[PDB]
Design a protein around this ligand. Structure first.
Ligand SMILES: *[C@@H]1O[C@H](CO)[C@@H](O[C@@H]2O[C@H](CO)[C@@H](O[C@@H]3O[C@H](CO[C@@H]4O[C@H](CO)[C@@H](O)[C@H](O)[C@@H]4O)[C@@H](O)[C@H](O[C@H]4O[C@H](CO)[C@@H](O)[C@H](O)[C@@H]4O)[C@@H]3O)[C@H](O)[C@H]2NC(C)=O)[C@H](O)[C@H]1NC(C)=O
Ligand SMILES: *[C@@H]1O[C@H](CO)[C@@H](O[C@@H]2O[C@H](CO)[C@@H](O[C@@H]3O[C@H](CO)[C@@H](O)[C@H](O)[C@@H]3O)[C@H](O)[C@H]2NC(C)=O)[C@H](O)[C@H]1NC(C)=O
Ligand SMILES: *[C@@H]1O[C@H](CO)[C@@H](O[C@@H]2O[C@H](CO)[C@@H](O)[C@H](O)[C@H]2NC(C)=O)[C@H](O)[C@H]1NC(C)=O
Ligand SMILES: *[C@@H]1O[C@H](CO)[C@@H](O[C@@H]2O[C@H](CO)[C@@H](O)[C@H](O)[C@H]2NC(C)=O)[C@H](O)[C@H]1NC(C)=O
Ligand code: JW7
Ligand code: JW7
Ligand code: NAG
Ligand code: NAG
Ligand code: NAG
Ligand code: NAG
Ligand code: NAG
Ligand code: NAG
Ligand code: CA
Ligand code: CA
Ligand code: CA
Ligand code: CA
Ligand code: CU
Ligand code: CU
Lengths: 705, 711
């Protein structure tokens, strides 16, 4: 049903006409809001509760009410707070409900709120107009400063301070490169900026970093320079070769392979539901959590209630302060908020289905981010399977793997994150994520090689880790799942038919995990080889109907626990976790963990807490990531190759046999058949389409802000 | 003067093979026999294939235009007609018109080759199958009429063989499963419960014995003693079906073709070329072969002119089994001693490679006296991957898109051994990276289901234990990173707890990078499930444009199982299993990890890869990395009929680490870019806007045409 569908523009609009009329005037378009104002920061779908939904999907029951969730910024008042407000019911809403206290247990400190655009906007005037011209001396000799500075530019960092309550953000300055990436031109200057106040006027600059040293203020600095105790070096504002560009010099060649659907496309997309002769599901994007799918049904049978992105994380080293503070909790800005338009042919097959996404964020109207998702089938040029017999009997049987794919890409500053869920006709599911886009760069002063690699002119490639977190609500043959751990061992035995001789007996080992903690594995420890969620049920051969989680992760090694900050993303700590699903444990991180991870608005280690995971509705949680030491070949961009991570969800005695066997595209023939004949196999039936083939739609592109 | 053009890594042609055969026939002093009919007592040309050039000479030719080296071939010859019958390895050249033949056996090995090390001939298997079906199985006719539909001769029944044949060096006794022959699908599942330990050391098959029998869960001392028991009542007997329907039985999908899978086509020109053993793209050039036993290999790999790696080449495949029954419980298959090339098979167009791949034949003289030809053995194609190599969308300050969809160059062969269908891959990325892949599909070696099961796998069909096994494969990677002389580096990370420099009250966990130089062979020998440097890479003395050594990172992609424990005498035969990764001084006497002759005497192996790792520097030398890659397999229902690929994609990457000064892809023709201020719908701004207006037009397809079956 149109049940897990993100909110229509119409829906978004009408929640707003409510919120506005029913929060009094004195409410502001968050576009232009100052901290001490009341504004609505986000209106997005409030996902239904699970029980109420299944009821409606499986057993007639009418459908749970369709409800928004507005995050409201309550600045204008003596005790300013943030408030999560459920609104509804949709399409024509009548009620509203502060749920804040329910969830966290008290109000939301106002300093956990995400920085607004207008806030950045103000912060830049405080620098571009009031702090930088103090050093218009130095900046002219270092970096082409002209009065009053539209050649330079800023980039936020990580958490914003050192202990809770702080709202002080280190910014770098970079040249405002035209039509290409600025992230590689760290002008050498970093600035701590305390913007904790509700009055921007009282914002200060607690610190300043230049070519290796720290000065309490900007005058403090420009002075120390003008005294000739500081060696300026002129940084070139211009260049050639990828450092400075993306447009390739080399001109177009013969076009690259195109895939097309000879007989027309073999899947559909209505609303946000996807349907192919193997899979149905519903897809979507959470403004902050990012992309998610639900009600994944493989040939009518539900495999998972939910797979979704929880969080994404990035944790730096560095020369500089702004780098060596920096840990972004990117959901803190928002994977959905920052899903960019997909470029037809580049991001996705020219012939994918490209779907729009709507949102109301920091505004009062909804806007659309066109071509936000793509769905497509993709021949892999690979057997799903195959056998060829020359022994005893002559036959061949195999099948080319085509795969179904849904994808969106989130561009958050330097990074373009690639989010893939892919659907194998073996009944398997792959989640992949890819880090591409630009890197974050420092400016380079000598004391370096512990903090990364010179990738350029003046440019340090600043070491970091990536990590990402997924919710996997497997309902293996319905809710009650257990969790098993199969692996392996050798055992010195006698050889039965020569007990004088020894053999090394290979054995499987199985073990049921009964307790939330026995199924929480840290990065650094050993996962077992075979690990799955079972049902009480068995398949025909008497084997716990099961789905296996096989992880593709290169231990993006974790910020140690001893840090004050770590509870902001305690999931980085874990390779894998399973818990009892619970409406009150609905997410792994939250938009609010960004600006105060010392007071986690949600701390994941909580979820794990001496409970049974024996015949309960379980949910597994997977972390995926790698170490990234940037190197020259990351210029201009980091590439996808090798940097795919995630996991496989694989059938494991779930079925009675490989369901591909019932496949429509299986190919089979014997030594004694005419393999060249169209009704021995259909490959030998070239005709297929009429005219000159793949009919192609005229190119367009989403656009920008 | 001369870059040197010769293709000296191309495997032998038919002519060439014939030539060598002719040469040998004559110089062997009759008594010589065709392999496909040889008795143990005979003399026999087992293999003849390419001999690879020594490396000095090759590069001399290829780099400094020197004259190329003698093209030679290796002959394996079983001398069974004598008092100390030996196997011998013979070099024969120089092709095309040979005129010399030298015995290299003793030089390579330190003495002659114990005769029993030799693989088992198609004859030997035939002779065995007679001893079985014609002098033994009748002694139990009764049983088999009852359980197993038997008559004169058995004919509905079929054998299959296990790995190490015996329990010491010197043993040649194989445990032989027996199974229902099946029309047009896998006999492997339909194991009847009988298993025979044939002793076939003797060169006189008359003297061959059966030393033990196993029916359905008990050991009898001989098929005669089993009739004794059978008819005297004392043997409870399980009746296992001849026939059936579905997965355990068929392979034919019972379903009509749907509409059509998606089809990949190069909408103008292809974009690479194959010319003999040599492939060439805009970015990449390399030669590709097939060892008979070692299997697929490529050589002389060149990214934009520059050679990255001299050789990459599967060295060996393993399969270690657990079980209830004597077959499965001691089966440690060492698949090269059958041969990954030998058992290569034809790629079925439209399935095993895209339809419009370029396919290619593969000639061989094996257990024969005239060369023969696997048709379509290799395929080469440009797979678009559906997925950017890189992109960046900019909404912030500056409005631009720049990106490029990864398209990729693949080279595939599949060895089919018994049940196994190994897909071998080598994949070339526009980034300048090289991905090795490996799959296992096909059917699964199974046992008759009986008793302790769960300790040895899952039941997977009626009477059918999908037994537990591990996989391993070994690879040779002779990088030669901008030069022969390389070192190996090991970078990783660490967190240092420090006080925040600008607020000394507080701490931070300070992220740092750790570069450590690996200087001795043993410091770069990493064992299974272990300490493994996140960034491990081989590099040059020479540095890039920003001062960092020029390097290639080896990124492993394995899930390996517990190796065979080292306390087994048999362990030595695949010592490479116990390593994820090694790096050694590359040598002419260290050419292969394994040996076709290891398989039948791992107790005294022909090669023991652990020998390559001796107190030796790897500080600036010719360096060859050795990646072991694989995993554990507990079969299950969805392995029926075939184990599927999805998720068993094992192997590794070769990834460029400060080898360049920028990403090569910056220069790709297929790159795309536009500014906000432009129309991206206009053909001159965007190559892709021009695809509808023009390119479209799919080609007419070649008529399908499979390359059929052997004998
Ligand atoms: C976080 O911050 C938010 C916003 O500041 C809080 O939201 C309000 O909190 C206060 C209590 O702390 C409550 O405000 C109530 O406002 C209502 C205003 O009237 C409504 O609109 C119309 C009339 O214009 C009516 O038709 C509706 O029935 C509404 O009532 C009002 O109902 C209520 O009552 C009265 O109480 C006092 C004392 O007598 C008077 O000041 C007032 O004039 C009136 O007589 C409150 O004033 C309510 O909880 C929230 N209001 C809204 C709109 O959300 C959160 O409570 C804060 N969170 C935390 C944890 O503190
Ligand atoms: C393995 O087997 C081969 C063949 O059985 C052995 O090689 C053979 O060695 C004999 C002598 O050892 C050679 O014959 C002799 O030639 C000389 C002069 O030409 C002559 O004086 C002798 O009377 C006899 O004719 C024979 O040619 C040679 N054959 C081949 C094909 O090389 C070999 O020695 C065995 N290997 C080992 C390690 O023992
Ligand atoms: C940063 O530089 C960019 C260009 O590199 C500026 O963007 C353009 O500037 C022109 C100036 O007339 C204006 O029309 C727009 O501002 C931009 N044009 C387009 C087509 O995008 C930008 O103003 C600079 N600085 C900041 C802080 O945004
Ligand atoms: C096992 O069964 C297969 C049936 O596929 C037999 O193969 C056929 O045998 C006949 C008689 O020899 C041949 O003429 C056909 O050409 C064969 N057909 C195929 C498809 O191979 C096989 O001979 C039987 N028995 C054994 C021991 O292999
Ligand atoms: O989306 C923005 C927008 C920023 N500034 C512009 C300023 C002008 C109007 C649009 C908002 C800015 C910005 N402006 N100065 C520093 N940063 N940052 N980010 C951002 C987004 C995700 C993650 C990090 C930053
Ligand atoms: O290629 C064969 C061929 C076998 N038998 C042949 C079939 C063809 C005619 C002569 C006898 C046999 C065979 N015949 N009886 C038992 N085995 N085996 N294998 C084989 C190949 C690779 C790995 C393992 C076995
Ligand atoms: C002094 C000189 O050669 N300057 C050139 C300039 O003309 C060109 O525009 C620039 C890219 O913007 O590259 C450089
Ligand atoms: C499997 O067992 C649980 C025991 O708690 C039971 O409640 C459940 O209903 C069983 N499954 C079915 C289909 O009855
Ligand atoms: C966990 O809960 C059980 C009650 O079901 C209790 O017996 C056990 O002692 C508890 N463990 C801890 C560490 O609190
Ligand atoms: C964290 O690390 C070790 C653990 O004993 C210790 O040196 C240090 O005191 C710990 N931090 C504390 C107690 O705040
Ligand atoms: C590196 O190799 C050796 C050191 O053992 C030396 O002779 C050679 O000159 C060196 N080359 C460079 C570029 O450092
Ligand atoms: C390696 O040999 C031994 C240890 O195996 C040691 O004494 C020696 O110093 C090493 N030799 C050289 C030449 O590097
Ligand atoms: Ca819990
Ligand atoms: Ca569940
Ligand atoms: Ca060595
Ligand atoms: Ca080397
Ligand atoms: Cu990165
Ligand atoms: Cu397997």
């Amino acid at each position: 049903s149109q049940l897990f569908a993100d909110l229509s523009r119409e829906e978004l609009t009408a929640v707003m006409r409510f919120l506005t009329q029913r929060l009094g005037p004195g409410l502001v378009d968050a576009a232009q809001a100052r901290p001490s104002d009341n504004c609505v920061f986000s209106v997005e779908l409030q996902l239904p509760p699970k029980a109420a939904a299944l009821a409606h999907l499986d057993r007639g029951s009418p459908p749970p009410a369709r409800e928004a969730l507005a995050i409201v910024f309550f600045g204008r008042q003596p005790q300013p707070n943030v408030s999560e407000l459920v609104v509804g019911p949709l399409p024509h809403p009548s009620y509203m409900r502060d749920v804040t206290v329910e969830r966290h247990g008290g109000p939301l400190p106002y300093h956990r709120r995400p920085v607004l655009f207008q806030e950045y906007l103000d912060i830049d005037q405080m620098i571009f107009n009031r702090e930088l011209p103090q050093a218009s001396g130095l900046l002219h000799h270092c970096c082409f400063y002209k009065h009053r500075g539209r050649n330079l530019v800023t980039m936020t960092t990580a958490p914003r301070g050192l202990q809770s309550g702080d709202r002080a953000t280190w910014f770098g300055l970079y040249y405002n490169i035209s039509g290409a990436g600025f992230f590689l031109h760290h002008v050498g200057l970093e600035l701590l900026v305390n913007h904790k106040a509700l009055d921007p006027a009282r914002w200060t600059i607690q610190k300043v970093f230049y070519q290796g040293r720290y000065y309490d203020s900007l005058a403090q600095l420009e002075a120390q320079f003008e005294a000739g105790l500081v060696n300026v070096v002129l940084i070139p504002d211009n260049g050639t070769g990828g450092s400075w560009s993306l447009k390739s010099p080399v001109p177009p060649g013969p076009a690259p392979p195109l895939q097309f659907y000879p007989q027309g496309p073999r899947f559909s997309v209505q609303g946000s539901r996807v349907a192919s002769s193997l899979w149905t599901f519903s897809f979507g994007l959470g403004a902050f959590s990012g992309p998610r799918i639900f009600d994944v049904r493989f040939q009518g049978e539900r495999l998972v209630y939910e797979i979704s992105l929880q969080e994404a994380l990035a944790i730096y080293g560095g020369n500089s302060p702004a780098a060596m503070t920096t840990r972004y909790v990117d959901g803190g800005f928002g994977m959905g908020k920052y899903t960019t338009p997909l470029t037809r042919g580049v991001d996705c097959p020219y012939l994918a289905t490209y779907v729009d996404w709507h949102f109301l964020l920091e505004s009062q109207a909804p806007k659309t981010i066109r071509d936000a998702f793509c769905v497509f089938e993709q021949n892999q040029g690979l057997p799903l399977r195959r056998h060829h017999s020359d022994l005893y009997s002559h036959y061949f049987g195999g099948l080319a793997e085509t795969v179904l794919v849904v994808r969106s890409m989130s561009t958050l500053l330097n990074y373009d994150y690639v989010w893939d869920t892919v659907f194998h006709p073996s009944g398997a599911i792959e989640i992949r994520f890819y880090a591409t886009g630009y890197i974050s760069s420092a400016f380079l002063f000598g004391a370096t090689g512990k903090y990364g690699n010179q990738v350029s002119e003046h440019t340090l490639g600043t070491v970091h880790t990536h990590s990402a977190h997924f919710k996997v609500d497997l309902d293996v043959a319905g809710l009650e799942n257990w969790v098993w751990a199969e692996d392996m061992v050798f055992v010195p035995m006698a050889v039965p038919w020569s007990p004088e001789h020894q053999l090394q007996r290979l054995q499987v080992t199985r073990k049921l995990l009964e307790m939330e903690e026995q199924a929480a594995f840290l990065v650094g420890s050993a996962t077992p080889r075979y690990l799955y969620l079972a049902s009480n049920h068995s398949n025909k051969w008497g084997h716990p109907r099961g789905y296996r989680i096989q992880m593709l992760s290169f231990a993006g090694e974790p910020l140690p626990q001893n840090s004050s900050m770590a509870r902001g993303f305690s999931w980085e700590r874990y390779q894998l976790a399973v818990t009892q699903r619970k409406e009150e444990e609905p997410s792994s991180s939250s938009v609010f963990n960004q600006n105060d991870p010392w007071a986690p608005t949600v701390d994941f280690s909580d979820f794990i807490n001496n409970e049974t995971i024996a015949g309960k509705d379980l949910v597994a949680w997977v972390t995926a990531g790698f170490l990234h030491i940037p190197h020259a070949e990351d210029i201009p961009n980091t590439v996808t190759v090798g940097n795919g991570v995630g996991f496989f969800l694989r059938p494991y005695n779930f079925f009675d046999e490989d369901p591909s066997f019932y496949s429509a595209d299986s190919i089979y023939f014997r030594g004694d058949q005419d393999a060249g004949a169209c009704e021995v196999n259909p490959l030998a039936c070239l005709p297929q389409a009429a005219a000159c083939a793949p009919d192609l739609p005229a190119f367009s592109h989403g656009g920008f802000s």
